Write a protein that binds this ligand. Structure first.
Ligand SMILES: CC(C)[C@H](NC(=O)CCc1ccccc1)P(=O)(O)O[C@H](C(=O)O)c1cccc(NC(=N)N)c1
Ligand SMILES: [Zn+2]
Length: 304
């Protein structure tokens, strides 16, 4: 069975996408935006009160297979949305005015592998020509200074950038969807772990985004909001100087598509458990993260 305070395998998450949609058709529509290398369905949930020409925020989880708290958060977010709509004034206004595109698990093949074989797998599970080595790092596979820094050209490496940008079916699927909906998507939020940070562009270069002052102020307020709940401390800043230079990430790519609010979230913790965050921290992690996401949403909406 599904549980929001446990990590769920893909079969269970998939069944959940169907069930939560069936139980809330007036707040959720489910589509598939492509298949993975191994033929799993890349679901996208459109969360919001349906209506014509609504702006949107796009959020994905599960880019990286071992970052299980990421997958957990997207599911947590969807429940909060459907349970509090109509009762909590902010979420009610959010869903009335915009849609959240929630992509609960991007790298499904890798996620399944962390359940079946290797908990610490990171990459996709696609084959590579001329080698037995498996997989591409999806967050090195976007057209953002592709493969120029912080990435490997070797398929046996954890940060393999791929044979070319969008060489992976999953990243191509995400990029295609975002490109087809640029008129509506106002923010891009991509959920990772761990490090307790909010990053904004750029990571592929030390250059700063034109609105970097605004992004810094926004990230600063979001981390302040997050801390109000349990005291959890986040830092923030441009990716390149705040964590490390790295090319081909989706946050940088989305920003260069014209999406002015683009953030990579790194959830708990700071390394004590690392990727293996206990299920006993799922609820607190998700609840505080919700405050940061809602703050950003409220800001983006108020500035349309
Ligand atoms: C613990 C966090 C920081 C994760 N990092 C890792 O697992 C380390 C990856 C690695 C493995 C082997 C050699 C070098 C680097 P991440 O979630 O994978 O970090 C993201 C990434 O490297 O794709 C990340 C963090 C912050 C900003 C970005 N954005 C970006 N465009 N690079 C991306
Ligand atoms: Zn990650």
């Amino acid at each position: 069975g599904h549980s929001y305070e446990k990590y769920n395998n893909w079969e269970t998450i998939e069944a959940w996408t169907k069930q939560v949609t069936s139980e809330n058709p007036d707040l959720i529509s489910r589509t598939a935006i492509g298949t993975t290398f191994l033929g799993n369905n890349i679901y996208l949930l459109k969360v919001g009160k349906p209506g014509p020409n609504k702006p949107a925020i796009f959020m994905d989880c599960g880019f990286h297979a071992r970052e299980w708290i990421s997958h957990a958060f997207c599911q947590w977010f969807v429940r909060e949305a459907v349970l509090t709509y109509g009762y909590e004034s902010h979420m009610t206004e959010f869903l009335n005015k915009l849609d959240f595109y929630v992509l609960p698990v991007l790298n499904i093949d890798g996620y399944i592998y962390t359940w079946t074989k290797n908990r610490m797998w990171r990459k996709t599970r696609s084959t590579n020509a001329g080698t037995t080595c498996i997989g591409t790092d999806p967050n090195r596979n976007f057209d953002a200074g592709w493969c120029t820094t912080g990435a490997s050209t070797d398929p046996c490496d954890e940060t393999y950038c791929g044979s070319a940008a969008e060489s992976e079916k999953e990243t191509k699927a995400l990029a295609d969807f975002i490109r087809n909906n640029l008129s509506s998507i106002k923010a891009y939020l991509t959920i990772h772990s761990y490090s307790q940070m909010i990053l904004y562009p750029y990571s592929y270069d030390y250059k700063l985004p034109e609105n970097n002052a605004e992004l810094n102020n926004l990230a600063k307020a979001a981390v302040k909001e997050l801390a109000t709940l349990y005291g959890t401390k986040y830092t923030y800043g441009p990716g390149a100087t705040t964590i490390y230079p790295a090319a081909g990430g989706s946050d940088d790519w989305a920003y260069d598509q014209g999406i002015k609010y683009s953030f990579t979230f790194e959830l708990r913790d700071k390394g004590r458990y690392g990727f293996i965050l206990p299920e006993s921290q799922i609820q607190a992690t998700c609840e505080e993260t919700m405050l940061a996401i809602k703050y950003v949403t409220n800001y983006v909406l108020g500035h349309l």
